[PDB]
Symmetry: C2
Subunit: 135 residues, 2 copies
Amino acid sequence: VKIVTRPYWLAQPPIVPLTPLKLPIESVRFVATNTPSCFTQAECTFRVRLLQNWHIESNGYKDINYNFVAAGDENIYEARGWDHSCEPPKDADELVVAFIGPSSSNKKIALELIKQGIKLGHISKNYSLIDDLEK
Amino acid sequence: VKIVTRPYWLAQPPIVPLTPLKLPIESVRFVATNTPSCFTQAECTFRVRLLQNWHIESNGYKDINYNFVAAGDENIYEARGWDHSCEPPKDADELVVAFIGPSSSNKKIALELIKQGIKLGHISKNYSLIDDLE
Ligand code: NA
């Protein structure tokens, strides 16, 4: 799976340091961002930057409040990543994968990411998948 | 343990994507950098930037070829970090911790990092410690 890391989408650092996530992760959650779809890396990159700015400045979060973001360009964007927890109202012990324009396509990509996470020991073999994409 | 993350030492990104590191890590290796000691974060940041440039440009590595760097300013610098393995001749399953001006000071902080890694599930409770400092 192709991950667009933080530097490649011009991420700013967390405004203050994030809290470490205990591994292996035992719960994964798929959520919808309910922001405009995007279909190229340039377009999706721009959207992720905006998401981060909004989460930090408008919401008062320390950083973009997901671990990863699947987008319409079929890329996974690194958000808080494997090792740091999201903050409330998200669960600190879940890997949160957000979706910009959820679809059959990027859902399969996100599932591939989970499979890799399991193989690499980031995600427990005994994990729960919480699919909130319909809401 | 205070970790100076990549953005805070002005790291460039890997030249190309790195290989993922499997967890839990079963082996930690201590290696010497053979670079001048540094005693302030300003000075150590400069040294770590220089190490990364050296590894990428002179050695042809994709990125600084350590996971963490322990320095004389008593800081740990995030290099490849928890998630990505070092490339050859380093082992793809080890956590490589480099030392700038290796000392009893450096070692204590490095051991704290390991203890933190174990608590967080990054490192096996039964990890091997490979000492390449000499
Ligand atoms: Na050279």
